Structure 1
Amino acid sequence: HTLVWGVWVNGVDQGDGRNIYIRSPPNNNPVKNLTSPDMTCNVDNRVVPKSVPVNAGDTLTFEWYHNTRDDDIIASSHHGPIAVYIAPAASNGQGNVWVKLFEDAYNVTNSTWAVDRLITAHGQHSVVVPHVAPGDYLFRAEIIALHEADSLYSQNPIRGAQFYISCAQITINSSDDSTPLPAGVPFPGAYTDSTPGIQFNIYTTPATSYVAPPPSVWSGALGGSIAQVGDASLE
């Protein structure tokens, strides 16, 4: 259980974005039905009033929280990968429009899942804004918690992979558009019961054997990181 509070741009807090520039759900309950419109931007997908200004090469940092900002972020049990996708706001998240900018499952070195490092990062994880066409975008941050992903939701609707999905409204002003955005995947649609990384037993199988759901990170992506980039306690 976890939600996005707001974003930082180049380490500068953009302030509370909930129902302002985040298309926020009414609570932190997971999405589990892979076929549901809820897979797009969670259970309350509607244009909210603001879109955060950024330029290509900016560092955009998502800040997640559990109950209160900068609390324990998400339950330690919710081991799993973290992905970020982008779509033209034009799409409203409909059609084959979602392009992956970031994937992080398990770091063999430190033996921590992306979710583990997010808690350590005080809920902060980032992507570098790609050189797409200036315009309005949705950035879809996705945490997959696998603490019950040994089952499928479609077979046993009280278990299954859990998706914490947050769409941010981002306006890209300055960009040379050196990497125009391709068509991407649909959500709902890209994840099915068969898709690798959806059904997996973190209790019996080693985390090094884990393979995150496709698609692969777009060649136009400029990477990203899970790490604190500023102190919410001083805001």
Structure 2
Amino acid sequence: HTLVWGVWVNGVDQGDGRNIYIRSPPNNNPVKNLTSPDMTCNVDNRVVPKSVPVNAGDTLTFEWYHNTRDDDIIASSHHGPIAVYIAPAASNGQGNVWVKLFEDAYNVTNSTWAVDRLITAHGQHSVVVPHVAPGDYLFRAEIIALHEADSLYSQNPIRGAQFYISCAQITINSSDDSTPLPAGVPFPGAYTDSTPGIQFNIYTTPATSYVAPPPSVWSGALGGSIAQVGDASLE
């Protein structure tokens, strides 16, 4: 159970984004239904009144939290991968529009899942803004908690992969549009019960054998990292 507080740009806090530039749901409950419109931008998908200005080559940092800012971030049990997608705002996230900018699942060296490193980073993970057409965008940050993903939600609705999904309204101002955004995948639709990484047993299968759900990260991406860029406690 986790939510996005706001974003940083180039290590500068853009301020509390909840229901402002983040299309925030009312609480930190997971989405589990792979076919639900809730897979796009969670359960209260609507235009919020601000969009964060960035330029191509900027570092955009999502900051997650559990109950209060810079707390335990997400329960340690919620081992799983982290992805970031982008689509143009005109889509409202509908159709084949979502392009993957970032993927992190399991790090064999440190023996840590993306989620484990997200807690250590005080909820912060980043992408570098790509050289797409200037205009308005949705950045969709997605945590998949796998602690009940040995079951499929479609078969047993009290278990399944847990999706923590947050859409940020981002406006790209300065960009040469030298890496125009290629075709996207749909959410809902890209993840199905047979998709690699949706049904997995983290208790019996080695984490080194985990494969995250496609699509692969776009070659145009510059992303990006799970790492603290700013200290929330200084504000």
TM-score calculated relative to the size of structure 2: 1.00
What is the alpha-carbon distance in structure 2 between the residues aligned to residue 161 and residue 9 of structure 1? 30
1:197-222 Cα offsets, whole Å, 9 max, x none, are: 00000000000000000000001001
Structure 2's unaligned 5+ residue stretches are none
What is the alpha-carbon distance in structure 1 between the residues aligned to residue 10 and residue 88 of structure 2? 22
What is the alpha-carbon distance in structure 1 between the residues aligned to residue 112 and residue 196 of structure 2? 20
Shift in Å, 1:124? 0.2
Partner of 1:188: 188
What is the alpha-carbon distance in structure 1 between the residues aligned to residue 36 and residue 154 of structure 2? 12
Partner of 1:145: 145
1:28-77 Cα offsets, whole Å, 9 max, x none, are: 00000000000000000000000000000000000000000000000000
What is the alpha-carbon distance in structure 2 between the residues aligned to residue 59 and residue 223 of structure 1? 8
Shift in Å, 1:157? 0.4
What is the alpha-carbon distance in structure 1 between the residues aligned to residue 163 and residue 169 of structure 2? 19
What is the alpha-carbon distance in structure 2 between the residues aligned to residue 51 and residue 207 of structure 1? 37
Partner of 2:224: 224
Shift in Å, 1:24? 0.2
What is the alpha-carbon distance in structure 2 between the residues aligned to residue 17 and residue 49 of structure 1? 10
How big is the alpha-carbon RMSD for the aligned residues of Structure 1 and Structure 2? 0.3
What is the alpha-carbon distance in structure 2 between the residues aligned to residue 183 and residue 20 of structure 1? 28
Question: What secondary structure, in the 3-state scheme, does the structure 2 residue paired with 1:143 have?
Answer: strand
Shift in Å, 1:182? 1.1
1:102-154 Cα offsets, whole Å, 9 max, x none, are: 00000000000000000000000000000000000000000000000000000
Question: Quick check: 1:2 aligned with 2:2?
Answer: yes
Question: What secondary structure, in the 3-state scheme, does the structure 2 residue paired with 1:154 have?
Answer: coil
Shift in Å, 1:166? 0.2
What is the alpha-carbon distance in structure 2 between the residues aligned to residue 195 and residue 230 of structure 1? 35
What is the alpha-carbon distance in structure 2 between the residues aligned to residue 95 and residue 47 of structure 1? 17
Shift in Å, 1:223? 2.1
Moved over 6 A (4+): none
Alignment size in residue pairs: 235
Partner of 2:214: 214
What is the alpha-carbon distance in structure 1 between the residues aligned to residue 183 and residue 37 of structure 2? 19
Shift in Å, 1:183? 1.6
1:154-174 Cα offsets, whole Å, 9 max, x none, are: 000000000000000000000
